[PDB]
Amino acid sequence: ALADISGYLDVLDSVRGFSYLENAREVLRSGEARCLGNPRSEPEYVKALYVIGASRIPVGDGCSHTLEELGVFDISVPGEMVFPSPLDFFERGKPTPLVRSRLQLPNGVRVWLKLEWYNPFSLSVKDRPAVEIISRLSRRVEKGSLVADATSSNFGVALSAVARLYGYRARVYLPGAAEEFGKLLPRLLGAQVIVDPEAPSTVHLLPRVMKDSKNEGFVHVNQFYNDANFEAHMRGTAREIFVQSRRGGLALRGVAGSLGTSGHMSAAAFYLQSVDPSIRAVLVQPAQGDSIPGIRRVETGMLWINMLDISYTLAEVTLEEAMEAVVEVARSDGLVIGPSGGAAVKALAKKAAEGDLEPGDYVVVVPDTGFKYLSLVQNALE
Numbered sequence: 001a002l003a004d005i006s007g008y009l010d011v012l013d014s015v016r017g018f019s020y021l022e023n024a025r026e027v028l029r030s031g032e033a034r035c036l037g038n039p040r041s042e043p044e045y046v047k048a049l050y051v052i053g054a055s056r057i058p059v060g061d062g063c064s065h066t067l068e069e070l071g072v073f074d075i076s077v078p079g080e081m082v083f084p085s086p087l088d089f090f091e092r093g094k095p096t097p098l099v100r101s102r103l104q105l106p107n108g109v110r111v112w113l114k115l116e117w118y119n120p121f122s123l124s125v126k127d128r129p130a131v132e133i134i135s136r137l138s139r140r141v142e143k144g145s146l147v148a149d150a151t152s153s154n155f156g157v158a159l160s161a162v163a164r165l166y167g168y169r170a171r172v173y174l175p176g177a178a179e180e181f182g183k184l185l186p187r188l189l190g191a192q193v194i195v196d197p198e199a200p201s202t203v204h205l206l207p208r209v210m211k212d213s214k215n216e217g218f219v220h221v222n223q224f225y226n227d228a229n230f231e232a233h234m235r236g237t238a239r240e241i242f243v244q245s246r247r248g249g250l251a252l253r254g255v256a257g258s259l260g261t262s263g264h265m266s267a268a269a270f271y272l273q274s275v276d277p278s279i280r281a282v283l284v285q286p287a288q289g290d291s292i293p294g295i296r297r298v299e300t301g302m303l304w305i306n307m308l309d310i311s312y313t314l315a316e317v318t319l320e321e322a323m324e325a326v327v328e329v330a331r332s333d334g335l336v337i338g339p340s341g342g343a344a345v346k347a348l349a350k351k352a353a354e355g356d357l358e359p360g361d362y363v364v365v366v367p368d369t370g371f372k373y374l375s376l377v378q379n380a381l382e
Helices: 005-013 021-030 043-052 086-092 127-137 154-165 180-188 203-216 227-247 263-275 303-307 319-333 339-354 374-381
Strands: 002-004 056-058 098-100 109-115 146-150 169-175 192-196 252-257 280-286 313-317 360-366
Touching: 002 005, 005 043, 005 056, 021 043, 021 263, 043 227, 086 127, 098 227, 109 227, 109 339, 127 154, 127 227, 146 154, 146 203, 154 169, 154 180, 169 180, 169 203, 180 192, 227 252, 227 263, 227 360, 252 263, 252 339, 263 280, 263 303, 263 360, 280 339, 313 339, 319 339, 319 374, 339 360
Parallel strands: 109 360, 146 169, 169 192, 252 280, 252 360, 280 313
Antiparallel strands: 002 056, 098 109
């Protein structure tokens, strides 16, 4: 029998650790899920279904059910694109677009760009973990409460909008080097902002956020450590590459992206590799000494990419190379992408040039829009 999974989402407030993911992986590998005699007694299996994007669960004494039958492939978007509220727009106005580029790459590697600025609050991929993280709070943390985090810019913006839509107040901490939209937009949205001109990185801010947390008693939602970040990208970003690849007819051989928290690329790699372990994941390593906004080298400490059973290959990319790909995408497709999206395109071009990638379709996740990075654009032009 099928039941609406939304009735069972208290397991999100109670399952802990990664062991449920082993269910997630098996259901995706098999394309089906077994009936649950008593669903409430399998909290780990229920969370596994949620995280892969099921809207219905198979319940009682019955037969197995396919991904399709569980709602993994259901269309959520109203065709006419009319939405009764901003959060409903964020939730049903999905997938974000996936568009074939005209940019030519070596060795039969065909590029598709997944455009994450098509998210309504931050114009970035950060809307998704922010919505997921706030909605989990919303049943344990009293309204009017302050929530806070460290950010490079995007998450701070997404968190201020979302916090306010749910009745919370927000505070964001940013390092001196963050973009102006990051310092300014959260104030427009009603948040407090704290800029530390000392902090040479976002993660360098974290000990101060934690200390202020103990002193002032605000909720530190910690995007670097909060599992709802990874889960957001599982049922959203990663699921959508899967669905879009299968319904669009792509011969999907890999995805390429960048790493901040590692939330979205770990989800993408983990989900897609559950379905077909040979799908590659090509990830940006910003070259030593270069700053590509929003992103970091692997070895500076990242939760999901390290702890989860994920294959990937790294490619070195300088800020100059990232911006040169911004320029070439612009001239080739008329699409203006952010430096981190340029970096990913480039990392994929490099792996394509070395001959380690099968010919096929590859999805590059473009975290945000290049409109936000004018002085980087000015410099790339010279």
